[PDB]
Ligand binder design. Structure first.
Ligand SMILES: [Mg+2]
Ligand SMILES: [Zn+2]
Ligand SMILES: [Zn+2]
Ligand SMILES: [Zn+2]
Lengths: 394, 49, 263, 113, 140, 66, 56, 133, 196
RNA sequence: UUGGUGUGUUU
């Protein structure tokens, strides 16, 4: 599907018959590990060997002219682990640090100075992340108008390639252009950018081993008070949509540009329940602690987002078909458990529950229609995408 | 199984249309070309003679 | 310096309290007592005649899981360095078994107690099926009916857990140190409050609580351990412990010799 | 079906040494040792025991891939010490502690019967 | 009995605790709607059980009502590819594909519906030990 | 099918404790309490006997093959 | 189906697995697939010895 | 060796986001409008509001890879209790005497303001710190 | 049983697992990162209900849409002498230095899908070609070859190294040699060679 | 070492 989707490699011979990869190359081929097939053509000449080794090798295809950015970054564990590693309050004893800096293939043989000397030498993990990244880098970023005093400890300034402050996250080391990887590529050629992924992934896997990280059913639970606040807010939202019903079915409603009465009615409904979902998910995001695992993963951006935690814990929102609320499949109702002409959110598919509490059956079924939309989309429009892409090629 | 053939990519016959309460399976349908067609008679199905 | 403190002992388990070693050395003992204990089990199986309701490698698999006595086992050598081409009575315990449901009615349970040692480099009491009591019929190998002739011939050779876990010496190993987290090596996840919800150890009452005014003893180290080395019955727990230490000694000494011989 | 041997965990090959040393010439007085046919069970025990000694400065091991029963270790002590000597003394101290351990355990099982 | 045409002309409550209008604020349970539109309903039908809306390869699933529904569809379209026990006479039958899974355990998250596919008396898998924790990058 | 020998997780031999388990069940015990009496205290040797369901009786329901 | 695109040889195919203990330009090869496929290296004056061993 | 010396008043402590790391803001006694902020570890050296702090900045603790310290040697730090090494990362000659030095202790921070006559020697790269009491 | 699928990535022997306070090791370790976007919270509910029904020793009714909350399962796991939300303090197997976060851990019902790797491994030097077109054959069963299809050629054009493409569509395929008369330009030229 | 139809499953 794009000009990286064939890439050259090198041969490593292993028993136990499967194909091994790095996991930074998972993004360009778009492969997961639920059973994909990947082929392996072999050159039969010297000529084609050099052709592959100088053009189609991975270190020369890092930067995609699709969007002039690197498209090979960091994936799930190495990313969320390194964000847990170089938070400010993370200290490591010397002994474990010996191994951790042994794992770098490009380490010279010199430990840094430990950032505490007394009363018992520790480190902070930002210097260990500084061991990997070579000498000759600069990267200055201002997030949200930070200072040079840094209260929230976000943002990023790097001089010499030693971190000065800042929580190293997706929006620095992910796929974002002008990030760390792009900068290393522009300033050092291909090969050092190849060794960047090796250094970071081996380091943060060894440390994410000896720390560890997990996820439990409590991590989507907030305390009873925040549950009360979310319940109050979404109940007030259902009061708001009752006001919408009251005025519009009492004919007090004003019509938007270009949309008639039912279209602006449904548009109002969509905005209002989206506001419900956004404020409720925001409160549930605000309460949760930072040793909480799920908030660490979303605040690392290796997987997932805000709407994930909102849907697991506070509210799933409105079930859709084709962007709209759900058709009255029958006359005037969209199951036989409802009354006629009730445009209440529990009729046409607003999950009031979390995922956690359980769904009423009707709400479960309306989410089944959501998955039905997703299935039909992903196995129908790919017809048009394949045919369009073939025609642009030819 | 459903004979629309496959001529017509239409997502109206592939919808989980909401007469389906207890008659077919809102979970089960294969991945891909069959999806939206193939309806497994429910655990309260009976066929009238 | 290091001190042993047995707390319980019976024949199916031992719960001791190893005190004052490093943490690595105690967990290295744990890894040994799962892995590197040379014992004896069923290594090549030859059916003479089978007609069962069960298939063949099935029953060879289940026989491979069967607990033998190997108390005397260190004067039996390893299979892959014993001085015979294929099996003799220097390094085998040849079980030949044929129970046979004679009479055309009923249920025939080939148990562990019917298993016959035919030979073995005796009179080392090896290769007997382990018996709870002596009226321990035991391991449920087969259920035979009318004429279902089951004539089997096994060899018993000597492997460790590294080849396969049918040579597991032992079963399940508890392990903990600092039950009151006075090093803050671990960090609790907690909703409300750390003290209330994580219930106390079974070794909480062997020490004191921490006092809230105390500082973090940064120069402290972990220093008192607790482990639980149960038995399959194949060995007795004292022998397990002894030979596990012995084997770990021998591996360390071989590393020493390769140092000194490269030297 | 490409499944190899599972006695690749402890039996050495023929012309491969069990203990393969290469001195690392980046820094003075450091060595790299290619252990054959082991796992962590040797390595961590050697790590913490080499850690607490004074004259030892740097010691670190890695297991390159856990589907291969080998590992490699780095060893830099101070200036004066040939580090091989220090590791041999380390083995001496460990077997000293454990043989004392077996001894008192034998005594304690004698009493507990 | 009703078919899809009488499904037009009915009025259902889901569970028989919802037929009597019930009695709070507990953050464990689930929230049925009030149905306060008709003050005096004439319910004509109530479901025997809601997990009877499923298909046969769908009632196997432990708690289908806590998931993202494409994964429900995936589990139902993978439950057919279990290795297990297909019929109990694999000694005499000669078939081009057959596979017996050795040690089949009835799941500890059984349903009440798996009595009626006999799956607790012919299971197709095991209970092994889940431990959801990134360990050494091998489950990335 | 028929009881395995060890546990799957730990490795305590359990296979003998099938017949005793049924005989304890015959008196009206409860299954957890029966596992309690047999000294099964980790849940590893509790799922290796508690889940297990029995087919080899059905295989001996075939009146003789030969 | 046969000229613009076709089927060819010296291919291979399997199911994959992740392995972070690796570089970025490395891919694991099962042994049997290494046995089946091959590559013609020219016998030159700088590679005789190993290639004779690969015969052996 | 020591290029700074002063004694400080602890006015604010922010544990906040960090369970092991706190932020102090120390306003000098001996010459005011010398503002000092130092992020610090609780459990190596717990501090509290309105204590006394002897604060020293050095560039060499003598009176290349770090080994852990011997007993036979000695340091400037031997009369101290919380010794952190840092790097001078931003030096800004500001206003009239708004002279701000930003030196980072590897994830930890240190802002310093005040007179030119004190800070004038500080223009270095690697600057320690040595909290007494 | 919630789709969180995948392959056996790696095999560890017994001691190298993490292991909780009693000696229990695990056998299957799905990923944290497999969860938070896939939003399958039922999988956690199954693991928890599993551990409780193991310890109290009976099979808990997980038929959906009951009043079985999470609270009853939480209280029962606590009041049978455990942590309320599943976790036990698990260890490194290579040190025993405690895993800083407490690890969630239990039994769950697993199954075995019909694919294996021993049925889809295939590689091919040469061999069976069709009579009709002399391009190598199609299917696994006859040891066929793979379809280096259109869009593979597209990405080869995008890289541009067309010499590789002249390897692929000439040399590992139906390489074939004909003749032409240079005047009428056709291939009618009859080829006898040992008479030349 | 067949063709040629057709079905179900994998990404
Ligand atoms: Mg996929
Ligand atoms: Zn012999
Ligand atoms: Zn068990
Ligand atoms: Zn012509």
């Amino acid at each position: 599907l794009h000009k990286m989707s064939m890439m050259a490699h090198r041969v490593k011979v292993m028993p136990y018959s499967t194909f091994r990869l790095n996991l930074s190359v998972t993004s360009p081929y778009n492969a997961d590990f639920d059973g994909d097939e990947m082929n392996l053509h072999v050159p039969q000449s010297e000529e084609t060997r050099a052709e592959l080794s100088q053009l189609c090798a991975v270190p020369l295809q890092i930067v995609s002219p699709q969007s002039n950015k690197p498209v090979m970054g960091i994936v799930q564990d190495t990313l969320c682990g390194v964000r847990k590693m170089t938070l400010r309050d993370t200290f490591i004893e010397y002994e474990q640090v010996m191994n951790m800096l042994f794992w770098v293939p490009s380490w010279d043989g010199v430990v840094p100075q430990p950032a505490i000397l007394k009363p018992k030498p520790l480190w902070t993990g930002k210097q260990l992340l500084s061991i990997a990244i070579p000498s000759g880098i600069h990267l200055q970023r201002t997030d949200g108008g930070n200072s040079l005093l840094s209260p929230k400890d976000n943002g990023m300034l790097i001089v010499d390639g030693k971190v000065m402050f800042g929580v190293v996250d997706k929006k620095t080391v992910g796929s974002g252009g002008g990030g760390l990887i792009h900068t290393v590529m522009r300033e050092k050629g291909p090969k050092i950018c190849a060794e960047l992924f090796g250094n970071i992934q081996k380091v943060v896997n060894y440390w994410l081993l000896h720390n560890g990280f997990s996820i439990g059913i409590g991590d989507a639970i907030a305390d009873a008070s925040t549950m009360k606040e979310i319940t109050h807010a979404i109940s007030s939202a259902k009061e708001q949509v009752q006001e919408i019903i009251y005025k519009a079915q009492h004919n007090e409603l004003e019509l938007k540009p270009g949309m008639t009465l039912r279209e602006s009615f449904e548009g109002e409904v969509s905005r209002t329940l989206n506001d419900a979902r956004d404020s409720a998910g925001r409160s549930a995001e605000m309460n949760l602690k930072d040793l909480n695992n799920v908030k660490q993963m979303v605040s690392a951006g290796s997987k997932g987002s805000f709407i994930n935690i909102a849907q697991m814990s506070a509210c799933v929102g409105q079930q859709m078909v084709e962007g709209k609320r759900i058709a009255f499949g029958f006359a005037d109702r969209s199951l036989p458990h409802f009354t006629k002409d009730d445009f209440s959110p529990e009729s046409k598919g607003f999950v009031e529950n979390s995922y956690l509490r359980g769904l009423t059956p009707q709400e479960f079924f309306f989410h089944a229609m959501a998955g039905r939309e997703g299935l039909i989309d992903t196995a129908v429009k790919t017809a048009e995408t394949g045919y369009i892409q073939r025609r642009l090629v030819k | 199984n459903t004979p629309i053939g496959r001529d017509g990519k239409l997502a109206k016959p592939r919808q989980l249309h909401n007469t389906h309460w207890g008659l077919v399976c809102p979970a089960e349908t294969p991945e891909g070309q069959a999806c939206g067609l193939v309806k497994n008679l429910s655990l309260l199905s009976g066929i009238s003679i | 310096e290091p001190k042993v403190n047995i707390i319980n002992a019976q024949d199916d388990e031992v719960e001791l309290m190893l005190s004052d070693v490093n943490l690595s050395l105690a967990n290295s003992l744990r890894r040994t007592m799962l892995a590197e204990v040379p014992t004896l089990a069923i290594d090549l199986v030859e059916i003479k005649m089978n007609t069962s309701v069960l298939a063949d490698e099935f029953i060879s698999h289940r026989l491979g899981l069967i607990p033998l006595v190997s108390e005397d086992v260190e004067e039996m050598k390893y299979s892959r360095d014993c001085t015979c081409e294929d099996y003799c009575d220097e390094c085998s315990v040849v079980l030949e078994l044929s129970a046979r449901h004679e009479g055309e009615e009923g249920t025939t349970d080939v148990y562990s107690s019917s298993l016959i040692k035919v030979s073995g480099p005796g009179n080392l009491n090896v290769g007997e099926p382990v018996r709870r009591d002596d009226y321990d019929q035991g391991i449920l190998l087969c259920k035979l009916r009318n004429h279902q002739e089951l004539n089997i011939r096994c060899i018993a050779k000597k492997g460790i857990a590294k080849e396969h876990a049918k040579w597991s010496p032992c079963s399940a190993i508890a392990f903990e140190y600092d039950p009151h987290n006075k090093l803050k090596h671990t960090d609790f996840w907690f909703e409300v409050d750390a003290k209330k919800e994580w219930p106390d150890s079974k070794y909480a009452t062997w020490e004191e609580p921490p006092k809230p005014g105390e500082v973090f003893d940064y120069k402290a180290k972990p220093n008192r351990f607790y482990m639980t080395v149960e038995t399959t019955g194949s060995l007795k727990a004292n022998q397990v412990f002894s030979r596990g230490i012995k084997t770990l000694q021998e591996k360390l000494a071989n590393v020493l010799f390769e140092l000194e011989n490269s030297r | 079906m490409n499944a190899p041997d599972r006695f690749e965990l402890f039996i050495l090959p023929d012309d491969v040494p069990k203990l393969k040393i290469t001195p690392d010439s980046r820094v003075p007085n450091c060595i790299i040792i290619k252990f054959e046919r082991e796992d962590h069970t040797l390595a961590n025990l050697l790590r913490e025991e080499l850690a607490l000694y004074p004259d030892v400065t740097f010691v670190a091991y890695k297991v390159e891939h856990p589907l291969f029963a080998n590992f490699v270790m780095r060893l830099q002590t101070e200036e004066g010490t040939r580090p091989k000597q220090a590791l041999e003394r380390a083995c001496a101290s460990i077997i000293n502690k454990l043989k004392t351990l077996d001894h008192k355990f034998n005594e304690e099982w004698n009493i507990k019967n | 009995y009703v078919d899809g045409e009488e499904e037009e002309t009915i009025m259902i409550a889901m569970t028989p605790e919802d037929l009597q209008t019930r009695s709070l604020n507990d953050t464990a349970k689930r929230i049925k709607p009030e149905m306060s539109t008709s003050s005096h309903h004439t319910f004509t039908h109530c479901e025997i059980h809601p997990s009877m809306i499923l298909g046969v390869a769908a009632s196997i699933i432990p708690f289908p009502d806590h998931n993202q529904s494409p994964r429900n569809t995936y589990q139902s379209a993978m439950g057919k590819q279990a290795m297990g026990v297909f019929l109990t006479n694999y000694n005499v039958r000669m078939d081009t594909m057959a596979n017996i899974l050795y040690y089949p355990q009835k799941p500890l998250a059984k349903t009440q519906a798996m009595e009626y596919l006999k799956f607790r008396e012919l299971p197709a898998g095991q209970n092994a030990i889940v431990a959801i924790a990134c360990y050494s990058g091998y489950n990335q | 099918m028929i009881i395995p020998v060890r546990c799957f997780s730990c490795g305590k031999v359990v296979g003998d404790k099938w017949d005793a388990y049924l005989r304890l069940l015959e008196e009206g015990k409860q299954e957890g309490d029966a596992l309690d009496e047999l000294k099964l205290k980790r849940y590893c040797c509790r799922r290796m006997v508690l889940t297990h369901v029995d087919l080899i009786e059905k295989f001996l329901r075939y009146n003789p093959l030969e | 189906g046969n000229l613009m695109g076709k089927r060819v040889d010296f291919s291979a195919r399997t199911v994959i697995s992740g392995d972070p203990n690796l570089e970025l330009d490395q891919v694991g090869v099962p042994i049997s697939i290494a046995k089946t496929l091959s590559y013609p290296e020219t016998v030159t004056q700088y590679n005789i010895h190993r290639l004779t061993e690969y015969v052996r | 060796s020591a290029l700074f010396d002063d004694i400080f008043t602890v006015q604010t402590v922010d544990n906040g986001r960090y369970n092991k790391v706190s932020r102090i803001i120390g306003i000098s006694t001996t010459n005011s409008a010398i503002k000092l902020t130092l992020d610090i570890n609780n459990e190596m050296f717990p501090v509290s509001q309105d204590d006394s702090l002897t604060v020293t900045l050095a560039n060499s603790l003598s009176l290349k890879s770090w080994r852990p310290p011997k007993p036979t040697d000695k340091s400037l730090a031997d009369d101290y209790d919380y010794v952190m090494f840092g790097t001078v990362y931003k030096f800004e000659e500001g206003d009239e005497d708004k002279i701000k030095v930003y030196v980072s202790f590897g994830g930890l921070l240190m802002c310093l303001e005040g007179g030119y006559k004190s800070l004038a020697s500080l223009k270095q790269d690697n600057l320690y710190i040595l909290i007494r009491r | 049983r919630h789709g969180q699928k995948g392959t056996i990535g790696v095999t560890y022997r017994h001691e190298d697992m993490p292991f909780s306070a009693e000696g229990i090791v695990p056998d299957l370790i799905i990923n944290p990162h497999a969860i938070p976007s896939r939003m399958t919270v039922a999988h956690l509910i199954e693991c928890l209900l599993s551990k409780v029904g193991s310890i109290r020793g009976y099979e808990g009714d997980a038929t959906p849409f009951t009043d079985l909350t999470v609270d009853a399962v939480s209280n029962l796991l606590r009041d049978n002498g455990y942590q309320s939300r599943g976790f036990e303090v698990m260890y490194n197997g290579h040190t025993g230095k405690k895993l800083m976060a407490q690890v969630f851990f239990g039994p769950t019902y697993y199954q075995r899908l019909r694919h294996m790797v021993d049925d889809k491994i295939h590689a091919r030097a040469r061999g069976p070609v069709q009579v009709l077109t002399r391009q190598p054959v199609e299917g696994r069963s006859r040891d066929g070859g793979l379809r280096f299809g259109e869009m593979e050629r597209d990405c080869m054009i995008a890289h541009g190294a067309a010499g590789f493409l002249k390897e692929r569509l000439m040399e590992a395929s139906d390489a074939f040699r004909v003749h032409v008369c240079g005047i009428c330009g056709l291939m009618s030229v009859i080829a006898n060679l040992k008479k030349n």
